[PDB]
Amino acid sequence: MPMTLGYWDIRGLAHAIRLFLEYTDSSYEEKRYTMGDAPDYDQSQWLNEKFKLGLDFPNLPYLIDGSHKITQSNAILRYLGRKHNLCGETEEERIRVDILENQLMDNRMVLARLCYNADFEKLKPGYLEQLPGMMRLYSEFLGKRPWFAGDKITFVDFIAYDVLERNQVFEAKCLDAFPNLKDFIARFEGLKKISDYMKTSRFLPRPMFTKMATWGSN
Amino acid sequence: MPMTLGYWDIRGLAHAIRLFLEYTDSSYEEKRYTMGDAPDYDQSQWLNEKFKLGLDFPNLPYLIDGSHKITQSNAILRYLGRKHNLCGETEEERIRVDILENQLMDNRMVLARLCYNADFEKLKPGYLEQLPGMMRLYSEFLGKRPWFAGDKITFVDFIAYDVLERNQVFEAKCLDAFPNLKDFIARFEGLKKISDYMKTSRFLPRPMFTKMATWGSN
């Protein structure tokens, strides 16, 4: 150690990982690659070492922890989760973690595809119309639980926070009809390690996507 | 009590699950919903039961095993995997399973989006541009290993088989340059439980997608 987390200098797919690394008091440093502004979108910083890290499927984000070279955000979170017994304990909890992890990726992508679409403005009405139903499902799933798997936090809460909070940034009022989700967001940001982290210059809530996005590129 | 696997009456997203249920000698029965023909595409068979199964995020496929109601193919596979200690054992193996699980899902979503798009014909070339690299990466990852996680089979091999086999149907010879992937397909289909299953009427290799698809609807 320290471990190395590599990703673009944006929130994107690494938000949950950065937050989880902080929560677990992990020893780590980061590579925050910069993408070119001009229509060139130069990625030389990343491309020059993309194949020199021992990654099987070279991609961003990646996590290097000794001999372990990992890509895919869910795999990185599970790896860290296993290290801290935060993947759910009971069979019931593990099932909730697995179901939600996948449901969240499905929803994350729907928003991502929309924001990366050149026709973003004309397509967003369709997304906003289905957003209440999307959020309703998460609200019903969480119920009165403090965390998504039950009474104890797991790595999936970090993915959940990222997705729910990002949607609230996209549409400020999307969680108002679902108080438990609003409480969840606050509860998450209230965790000592997270609260402290958010007051530091290392916290990177924006930009949401890369400079190639139509929305959230800043 | 036999478990219940619910999904459309097509291969679609439930192929790895059906094959894994067979390999693990699981006691199960299925619900194979039928979709109406165009232009209506009636889903009433599913819709009239979708919200009465106790599922958190109603979707297909789903697995019912006692009090455990599960959706999301990866979650269903992990549930079955834990029951049989087939999620990888060493940290190295679990990492391989996790990385590949996610890599394969990304691949599946890309092809699905293409085949369900009305502009399939015009968009197909774009997918083929990326196919060679995708297949090469899987080939390099497998290397000389008999299974993707190492020397022992895991649930991820079932997802891999499904994706590899499906892409070979989409583009014949896309595996020709990778003997180890061809050998993997033969090794998988050669497994006793799988070989026997493929000779029965319960085996459902086609169609690849629902009637709403432009390609693979049959």
Q: What is the CATH number of the domain that holds A142?
A: 1.20.1050.10
Asked if A102 and A148 sit in the same domain, the reply is yes
User: Is the domain of A59 the same as that of A115?
Assistant: no
Angle at alpha carbon of residue B105, lines to B175 and B55, rounded to 5°: 140
The answer to whether the bond into B2 is cis (omega within 30° of 0) is no
| 3-class DSSP string for B11-75 | CCCCHHHHHHHHHCCCCEEEEEECCCCCCCCCCHHHHCCCCCCCCCCCCCCEEEECCEEEECHHH
Give which of A97, A60, A62 is closest to A82, Cα–Cα: A97
Shortest Cα distance from A196 to chain B (angstroms)? 31
Instruction: State the residue for tokens 């095993």.
Output: B65
| Complete edge-to-edge strand list for the sheet that includes strand A62-65 | A28-33, A3-8, A62-65, A68-71
What is the distance between the alpha carbons of residues A7 and B115, in angstroms, rounded to a whole number?
Answer: 31
DSSP string, chain B: --EEEEEESSSTT-HHHHHHHHHTT--EEEEEE-PPPTTT---HHHHTTTTSS--SS--SSEEEETTEEEESHHHHHHHHHHHHT-S-SSHHHHHHHHHHHHHHHHHHHHHHHHHT-TTHHHHHHHHHHHHHHHHHHHHHHHTT-SBTTBSS--THHHHHHHHHHHHHHHSTTTTTT-HHHHHHHHHHHHSHHHHHHTTSTT-----SS-TT-SSS--
- Among residues A30, A100, A87, A98, the alpha carbon closest in space to that of A61 is found at A30
DSSP assigned state of A13:
G
Asked if B118 and B56 sit in the same domain, the reply is no
A149 lies in the same domain as A200: no
Same domain for A104 and A151: yes
Residue of A nearest to B66 (CA): A92
Q: How far is CA B213 from CA A65, B6, B54, B83, B115, in A?
A: 43, 20, 29, 35, 6
Q: In total, how many domains does chain A have?
A: 2
Residue to test with chain B: of A17, A55, A56, A62, most B Cβ within 10 A? A56
B180 and B143 in contact (C-beta within 8 Å)? Answer: yes
State the Cα torsion B184-B185-B188-B194 to the nearest 10°.
180
| A144/A130 Cα distance (integer angstroms) | 24
- Which CATH number do you get for residue A10? 3.40.30.10
Q: What is the resolution of this structure in A?
A: 1.6
Of A73, A91, A99, the CB nearest to B57: A99
Separation of alpha carbons A46 and A48, rounded Å? 5
CA distance A79 to A62: 12
Considering the domain architecture, whether residues B136 and B156 belong to the same structural domain is answered as: yes
Enclosing domain of residue B186? 87-191
State whether B68 and A95 contact (CB < 8 Å): yes
Say yes or no for a CB contact (<8 Å) between A82 and B72: no
Contacts A–B by Cβ distance under 8 A:
76
User: One-letter amino acid identity for B209?
Assistant: F
Q: Which amino acid is at B186?
A: A
Pairing of strands A3-8, B3-8: unpaired
A120 touches A113 (CB < 8 A)? no
In this structure, what DSSP letter does residue A36 have? P
Those residues whose C-beta lies under 8 Å from the C-beta of residue A148, and which sit 6 or more positions away, are A96, A97, A100, A141, A142, A154, A156, A157, A160, A184
Q: B205 preceded by cis ω (within 30°)? A: no
CB within 8 Å: A72 and B103? yes
Contacts of B120 (CB under 8 A, 6+ apart): B114, B214, B215
Do residue B71 and residue B140 come from a single domain?
Answer: no
Task: Note whether B181 and B200 are same-domain residues.
Answer: no
B70 and B93 in a single domain? The answer is no
In sequence order, what are the beta bridge partners of A7?
A: A32
Statement to judge: residues B208 and B170 lie in one domain: no
d(CA B138, CA B88): 18
Q: How was this structure determined?
A: X-ray
Q: Do B75 and A99 touch (CB under 8 A)?
A: yes
Looking at this protein, which amino acid is placed at residue B47?
L
DSSP state of A146: S
CA atoms within 13 A on the CB side of A186: 7
Claim to verify: residue B136 and residue B163 sit in the same structural domain: yes
Judged by CB atoms closer than 8 Å, whether chains meet at A75 and B95 is answered as yes
**Count of beta carbons in the 10 Å neighbourhood of residue A131:** 19
A95 vs B73, B75, B109: nearest CB: B75
CA–CA dist A55, B96 (Å, integer): 11
CA distance B73 to chain A (A): 9
Query: How many residues are recorded in chain A?
Result: 218
Q: Are residues B62 and B157 in the same domain?
A: no
C-alpha distances (whole Å) from A8 to each of A16, A31, A61 are 14, 8, 8
**Cβ atoms of residues B217 and B37 within 8 Å:** no
Name the region of B88 (left: φ>0; alpha: ψ -120 to 50; beta: rest).
Answer: left
**Is the CA virtual torsion A131, A133, A134, A136 positive or negative?**
positive
User: Do the chains contact at A99 and B56, CB–CB below 8 Å?
Assistant: yes
